Design a protein around this ligand. Sequence first.
Ligand code: BCL
Ligand code: BCL
Ligand code: BCL
Ligand code: BCL
Ligand code: BPH
Ligand code: BPH
Ligand code: SPO
Ligand code: FE
Lengths: 238, 280, 301
Amino acid sequence: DLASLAIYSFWIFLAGLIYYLQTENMREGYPLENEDGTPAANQGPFPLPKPKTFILPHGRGTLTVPGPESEDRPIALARTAVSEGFPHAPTGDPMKDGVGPASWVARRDLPELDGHGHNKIKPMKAAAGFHVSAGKNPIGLPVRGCDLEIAGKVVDIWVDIPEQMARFLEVELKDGSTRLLPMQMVKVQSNRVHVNALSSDLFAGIPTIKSPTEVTLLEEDKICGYVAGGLMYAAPKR
Amino acid sequence: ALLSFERKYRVPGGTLVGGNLFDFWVGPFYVGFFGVATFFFAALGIILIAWSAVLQGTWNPQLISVYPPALEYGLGGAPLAKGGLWQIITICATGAFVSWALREVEICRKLGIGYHIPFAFAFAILAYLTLVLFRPVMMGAWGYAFPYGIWTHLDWVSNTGYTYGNFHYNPAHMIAISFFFTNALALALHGALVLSAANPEKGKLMRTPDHEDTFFRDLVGYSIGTLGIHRLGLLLSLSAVFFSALCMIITGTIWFDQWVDWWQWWVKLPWWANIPGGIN
Amino acid sequence: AEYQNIFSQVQVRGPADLGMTEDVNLANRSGVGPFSTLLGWFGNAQLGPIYLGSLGVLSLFSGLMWFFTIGIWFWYQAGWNPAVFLRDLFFFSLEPPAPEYGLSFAAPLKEGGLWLIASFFMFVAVWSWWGRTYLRAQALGMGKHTAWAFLSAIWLWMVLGFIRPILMGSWSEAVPYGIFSHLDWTNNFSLVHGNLFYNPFHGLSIAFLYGSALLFAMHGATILAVSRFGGERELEQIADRGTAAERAALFWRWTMGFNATMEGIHRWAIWMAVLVTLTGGIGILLSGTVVDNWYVWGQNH
Ligand code: BCL
Ligand code: BCL
Ligand code: BCL
Ligand code: BCL
Ligand SMILES: CC[C@H]1c2cc3[nH]c4c(c3C)C(=O)[C@H](C(=O)OC)c4c3nc(cc4[nH]c(cc(n2)[C@@H]1C)c(C(C)=O)c4C)[C@@H](C)[C@@H]3CCC(=O)OC/C=C(\C)CCC[C@H](C)CCC[C@H](C)CCCC(C)C
Ligand SMILES: CC[C@H]1c2cc3[nH]c4c(c3C)C(=O)[C@H](C(=O)OC)c4c3nc(cc4[nH]c(cc(n2)[C@@H]1C)c(C(C)=O)c4C)[C@@H](C)[C@@H]3CCC(=O)OC/C=C(\C)CCC[C@H](C)CCC[C@H](C)CCCC(C)C
Ligand SMILES: COC(C)(C)C/C=C/C(C)=C/C=C/C(C)=C/C=C/C(C)=C\C=C\C=C(C)\C=C\C=C(/C)CC/C=C(\C)CCC=C(C)C
Ligand SMILES: [Fe+3]
């Protein structure tokens, strides 16, 4: 009867939707590979989707996915066993080499742009009309490391203009040079700013930016990745 | 077996128990001590459900159904065929759910991310434990809990609801339903937004989070923001479950009469309690 | 304790954002309302501006007419007494015309005409608002997703009070405007049709409703767990995958064997929810028109 026709036609529809949705989610990462980087034998039941192209605004070109996948960087890792599935060990300084929880991606070395083509994240000193309208103002506060030692001070807040939001804290170090700490990894307290992920002696390590008034997608990733890897790698000092 | 960008993430460490013993993967699945723990609890539980299948005399999934001890057994143990199985399976289900959560924690430590996922899962873990553990124990018998059956458990809902009349009247149930309905409206929107942006009319350029925020200000005069909608989504959810667990812990313990009558406290307020007219 | 990113630690405010222009008629946009320090801790602080427009006003008007029309009736039943009104606010009700009147607009005001009045206003209010959510997106040059997903909700709404009552032969099958009374209507609709738990669409509806709540928890929690890598900036993470979208993807692959993309997860999100009122609409349409009892049906199919 009509009802029986309806529910069946639906489970058919639902299986095509699961098919559709699953392939759409295979635009990145695929095709799979073996630990050695060569294409794997079994790719699953689902096939790669037909390429779609994004036309990025502000003449930044286009993006096609799925497309040729490459890390475009060296991986300082080595196998720990003679078969598949086991951890790969860092051959150098995981933090410096950028592996594990300290991994970063080789995103474009350009800064993200707002609707009108202007840099998304600007330090607040060059951001017109922006000020701290609530909560404690970090600027001027000493920054402490997971080892309870002072690593520097906050000299400015980098903000996201279109969304009016704190994204970074520019910190000056003992040697007069600055670095950015992701807002999300710091705890602004009454008389200081505590950073649990890193220890004092590691702040100098944080990757630096090339221009003093902007951050590039790449640079953000390196910084964030570095600060996060500290959680696991700093530990012997925290 | 790996995603084009996976290897660099597969490093050692992060485990909570057993150092490097179980620190390894099987296909895409990460293992870990807890990877093991849930396989044990899961299999043992499945076995027991299968065994309770033979004691009932059936292999149809739509008929199998593991019932709890009868209200006569109180909060004590019972014979396998009359509630003893449900009690052990319940022990096994909780062992799997918890383990699974802890497993996600070790997967976070390895990826260096936040513990928001396993934290949000603990909220469903709570809902379940309210139904099969806290409510029974406060009422005094494993029998108030629900059966593990595809339809038999729906009955339990239907019977447990109508015990207090039209459950619609439970105030915490009304609050919980709101969060659910909202949470869906919200997810429906956030997904259509991000997509109407990345997938603009044919030919044009990908829009920017600026057009998103814009779009909503024009529509309703406000935009919560990309970091806000994700906080909201996480919040509408966990809340809908919080109030759900709450609406049940109070039903059959601090209130056991028809729910619709609970609303009299409002209508029987001295001020208007006697004024004539209206509906009351 | 580390920072969880649920509430901001320091707010920052700049010049009011007038938004993108594109092909929008800037003559219809109002002026930036105030800034809320409250909402700031959670989301954006800026209220407004909002776009009015002809469709915006037609809707907003119908909308209040519908709301006032019901209320005129509630006050009526309260004998215009302020204390009663407040006391029984939950029990009042604007019921539809009686069965006798069938599908006619002849029924007297005091017995369903006033209901028909209201519904008309609500019918205009809704659809016009749909149109609005379509045009606003066109002005900005974005996809029509929001408009389409809204239709799904309209679907169930439409079935419950218009589509089904037309296929039955009377406005008496529609829902009454009342808080408690529309709850009572729901309970009845189940009993009369042999317990809706036997309705397979209703069963599926609940699946997605629960699913939507599962998914957002998942998605939300995820984007916040990798916010420390700029995860919330989904769109640029779409065009230029960052460590944020990779770790995100890998947490779920390692956990449950498979994962999504920064753009794909939204395609899941958009459907998961949309199907709730999609299947739910069907389920209610086939109740009383084709299937009289879902238990009986459940026995034969
Ligand atoms: C789907 C099956 C049933 C149904 C079953 C239920 C059930 C079951 C419950 C509700 C409840 C509600 N239903 Mg209903 N409801 C149906 C159809 C409707 C129709 C319309 C169809 O086209 C509407 C608008 C409503 C509207 C509502 C809300 C007034 C209320 C839920 C709050 C909420 O979060 O809403 C989602 C919407 C938003 C978040 C956005 C807009 C916000 C709204 C306007 C806020 C209303 C607040 C309310 C007036 C608070 C009063 C408290 C004061 C202290 C006095 N229902 C259908 C027919 N409805 C709940 C309740 O608590 O009822 C008493 C409840 O338990
Ligand atoms: C006729 C019956 C009554 C009624 C009786 C009840 C009763 C009785 C209860 C509810 C509950 C609920 N009701 Mg009701 N309800 C009625 C009408 C309604 C209406 C409506 C529009 O009419 C609505 C929207 C609701 C809505 C709701 C929800 C708010 C709530 C259930 C969600 C929940 O707790 O999830 C929580 C989630 C869980 C408990 C699941 C936990 C999942 C676990 C952690 C993991 C499992 C993993 C699995 C084993 C793994 C499989 C792995 C494989 C590889 C796949 N009810 C009627 C009037 N309702 C329930 C509630 O509040 O519960 C606390 C409840 O007990
Ligand atoms: C919340 C209040 C009631 C309740 C009320 C209802 C009501 C009312 C309905 C359901 C329905 C369902 N419920 Mg229930 N349910 C409860 C508690 C549970 C628990 C638990 C561990 O406590 C579990 C596993 C389930 C599971 C289920 C599903 C089988 C089915 C919904 C599909 C869905 O989309 O789900 C949401 C989850 C997802 C989309 C995620 C994917 C998970 C999959 C679907 C899990 C499959 C589990 C499989 C059937 C069990 C395998 C066990 C083996 C040992 C491995 N319920 C409580 C006690 N449930 C619906 C149905 O169609 O029933 C016949 C329905 O209408
Ligand atoms: C005792 C009664 C029956 C029962 C009877 C029904 C009936 C009858 C119906 C449902 C429906 C639903 N039931 Mg039930 N249901 C029962 C038990 C349950 C249980 C449970 C755990 O026991 C659960 C989880 C559910 C769950 C559900 C949902 C999946 C579904 C509604 C989806 C929705 O979002 O609607 C809400 C969404 C809408 C109403 C959309 C339309 C909204 C419009 C467009 C907006 C108007 C806005 C207004 C003009 C503006 C207001 C805002 C201003 C700012 C003021 N039911 C019991 C067994 N259920 C509905 C369905 O679709 O079923 C198939 C339905 O008709
Ligand atoms: C805010 C709470 C919301 C939520 C969140 C949530 N769920 C989650 C997570 C989160 C954050 C996960 O990380 C986790 C996940 O991995 O998702 C992909 C998960 C998950 N949510 C799940 C289910 C689920 N969530 C639900 C709900 C919700 N989840 C809420 C809406 C429901 C409903 C609505 O009922 C269900 C069924 C699982 C698919 C998955 C966790 C998987 C897991 O723990 O797996 C290992 C466990 C086993 C192998 C257990 C078997 C145990 C026993 C041996 C047998 C079965 C016993 C059981 C009593 C039978 C019941 C039969 C029914 C017919 C009655
Ligand atoms: C999968 C389907 C889910 C869904 C989706 C959904 N809803 C949507 C959309 C989508 C995709 C929209 O795009 C649309 C929207 O605009 O969202 C922001 C909307 C929407 N979903 C709404 C409601 C809603 N959705 C619900 C459910 C759901 N929506 C599902 C869960 C429910 C429930 C659970 O019952 C409700 C009540 C509306 C708020 C909104 C569409 C607005 C509309 O139709 O408006 C007509 C206008 C009026 C009725 C105006 C009068 C309002 C009041 C009566 C008066 C008081 C307020 C007024 C502002 C006072 C003015 C005073 C003066 C002095 C100034
Ligand atoms: C403080 O006092 C004042 C005066 C300010 C006013 C106060 C107002 C109050 C207190 C209002 C209270 C109203 C409430 C609580 C209303 C609740 C409604 C609810 C809970 C549910 C509504 C369900 C309705 C749905 C199912 C309705 C669907 C309607 C349609 C699909 C349209 C129907 C169309 C018809 C009859 C035909 C019209 C003509 C055509 C063909 C175009
Ligand atoms: Fe998102």
